[PDB]
Amino acid sequence: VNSFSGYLKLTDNVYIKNADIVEEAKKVKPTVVVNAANVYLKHGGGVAGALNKATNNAMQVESDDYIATNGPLKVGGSCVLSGHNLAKHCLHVVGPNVNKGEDIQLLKSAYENFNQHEVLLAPLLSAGIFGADPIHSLRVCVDTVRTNVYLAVFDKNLYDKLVSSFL
Numbered sequence: 001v002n003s004f005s006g007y008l009k010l011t012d013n014v015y016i017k018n019a020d021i022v023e024e025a026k027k028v029k030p031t032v033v034v035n036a037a038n039v040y041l042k043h044g045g046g047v048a049g050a051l052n053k054a055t056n057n058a059m060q061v062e063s064d065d066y067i068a069t070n071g072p073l074k075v076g077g078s079c080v081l082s083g084h085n086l087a088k089h090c091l092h093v094v095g096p097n098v099n100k101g102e103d104i105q106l107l108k109s110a111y112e113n114f115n116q117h118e119v120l121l122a123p124l125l126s127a128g129i130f131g132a133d134p135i136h137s138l139r140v141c142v143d144t145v146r147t148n149v150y151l152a153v154f155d156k157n158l159y160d161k162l163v164s165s166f167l
């Protein structure tokens with residue numbers, strides 16, 4: 001039993017809610033919140049911009065030190081950093097950005113990072129400003145993640161389409 005509330009159960013391990021991931025994180029304070037990161041950990045917009053703003057830019061400061069030490073992530077890769085005031089940990093995961101021409105097959109590799117964590121609050125990878133089809137992202141999530149994932153979908157109109165079209 002966990003403290004996630006109001007989610008629709010899609011499968012054995014995947015749950016979905018129309019919610020602002022920032023507000024969800026502040027309420028639940030989960031062990032792991034997933035960020036929709038880029039390889040440079042430049043949290044300018046989308047989910048990343050919103051999560052970073054909620055940390056008063058502390059996420060960006062930590063991220064800049066991480067990149068200065070380690071260099072960029074791989075598309076499809078991840079790193080674990082602090083969750084600041086939002087969660088114990090933040091799993092920064094880089095899904096392919098279709099608006100940069102990146103290979104959508106890497107979306108499965110991106111979701112595989114979730115399997116290293118028993119429970120996660122997460123957005124749909126590569127959705128929003130990363131330009132992938134969120135219906136496809138949900139399908140890859142369900143077919144790849146085996147740990148317990150609670151998906152927050154900000155857009156209510158999108159949330160309803162994801163549920164009604166879910167196979």
Ligand SMILES: O[C@]1(CNc2ncnc3[nH]ccc23)C[C@H]2CC[C@@H]1CC2
Binds near residue numbers: 050
């Ligand atoms: O890019 C996404 C993800 N963006 C977010 N998802 C959850 N909480 C959030 N808080 C701030 C931004 C944000 C994927 C779909 C739903 C919303 C947008 C556009 C389409």
